[PDB]
Amino acid sequence: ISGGDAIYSSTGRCSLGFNVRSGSTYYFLTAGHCTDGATTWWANSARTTVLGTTSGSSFPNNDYGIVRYTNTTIPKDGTVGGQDITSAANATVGMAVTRRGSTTGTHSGSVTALNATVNYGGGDVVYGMIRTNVCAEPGDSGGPLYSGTRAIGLTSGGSGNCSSGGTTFFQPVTEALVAYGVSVY
Amino acid sequence: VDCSEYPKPACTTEYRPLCGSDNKTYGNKCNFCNAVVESNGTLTLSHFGKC
């Protein structure tokens, strides 16, 4: 399983962000709004293939979460679909980026702003978000935003859609890597 | 599902589908409620889950 692939909780479906590790312990990052209130994660809608259990969740304010793998046999590719990921970097205005999600697949665009505040309502406000002109739709949450072999962010949300075009906000991945002391591979 | 707190300028992108009276499956409550507002209150909920 790799970045952009579907992940299922007891509540719904999101996408795997990046496979990361600390020492010999493997985890995967995804959106905090997906990990919030989620315990177990599965690889299929039938919930027969277990992936792991939620180890951390930060939402709102930030939007990232981490899941510890408990499945010993499932391959944990350090890629996004076929795309190898070798490092993480900070987003910059004008940077060409690409997102992969379990609903819409792969879409590209550019970073249009940094440090954006997104108010999802009901007190669910997230800060320091990367703004882009890349589309995203329900199910794409937590999927990776990358630039070549560089990991950049995790899909949080936005407006519009892939048909008419939209605006999507991403949580900077560097912040998540630092919080959990993990690294991409 | 109540859409009084709508519309909202952005929605998170998790998938928990709802079926609207227009036979369209809406990806989540936020997407559904924004559509209801955009329809000026003409769209309604048919049932939970996919259409």
Candidate list A33, A57, A107, A156, residue with the active-site label: A33
What's this structure's resolution in Å?
1.6
Count how many domains chain A has.
2
Same domain, A145 and A95: yes
Q: How far is CA B35 from CA A49, A108, A119, B12, B31, in A?
A: 35, 25, 18, 15, 6
Same domain, A93 and A126: yes
Same domain, A133 and A67: no
Beta-carbon contacts below 8 Å between A and B: 71
Among chain A residues, the shortest Cα distance to B16 is held by: A12
Same domain, A57 and A92: no
Candidate list A9, A141, A147, A156, residue with the active-site label: A141
Q: Would you call A127 helix, strand, or coil by DSSP? A: strand
**Residue A171 Cα, gap to closest chain B Cα (Å):** 12
Interface contact flag, B13 A118, Cβ < 8 Å: no
Same domain, A109 and A61: no
**B31 touching chain A per CB within 8 A:** yes
Is the C-alpha dihedral spanning A127, A133, A139, A142 positive or negative?
A: negative
Interface contact flag, B12 A103, Cβ < 8 Å: no
Same domain, A155 and A108: yes
Q: How does strand A87-88 pair with strand A150-161?
A: parallel
Same domain, A87 and A28: no
Written out in words, the top-level CATH class of the domain with range B1-51 is alpha beta
Same domain, A89 and A159: yes
- Structural domain containing residue A149: 78-172
Q: How far is CA A30 from CA A130, B4, B9, B22, B49, in A?
A: 16, 30, 22, 32, 23
Distance of CA A92 to the CA centre of its chain: 18
Same domain, A83 and A165: yes
| E strand or H helix at A147 | strand A144-147
* Phi, psi dihedral angles at A123 (to 5 degrees): 85, 5
Tokens of A145: 């935003």
Close Cβ partners of A46 (under 8 Å, ≥ 6 residues apart): none
Q: How does strand A64-69 pair with strand A25-30?
A: antiparallel
Distance CA B4, CA A15 (A): 29
Same domain, A87 and A138: yes
Q: How is chain B split among helix, strand and coil, in percent rounded to 5?
A: 20, 25, 55
**CB A156 within 8 Å of CB A118:** yes
Residue A161's CB: how many other CB atoms inside 10 A?
15
Q: How far is CA B50 from CA A163, B20, B27, in A?
A: 20, 9, 9
* Phi, psi dihedral angles at A156 (to 5 degrees): -105, -50
Same domain, A88 and A154: yes
Taking contacts as CB-CB distances below 8 angstroms, the residues of chain B near A13 are 14-15
Interface contact flag, B9 A11, Cβ < 8 Å: no
Torsion of CA B34, B35, B39, B43, to 10 degrees: -120
Taking contacts as CB-CB distances below 8 angstroms, the residues of chain A near B33 are none
- Domain at A35, CATH number: 2.40.10.10
The DSSP letter of residue A72 is: S
Same domain, A70 and A117: no
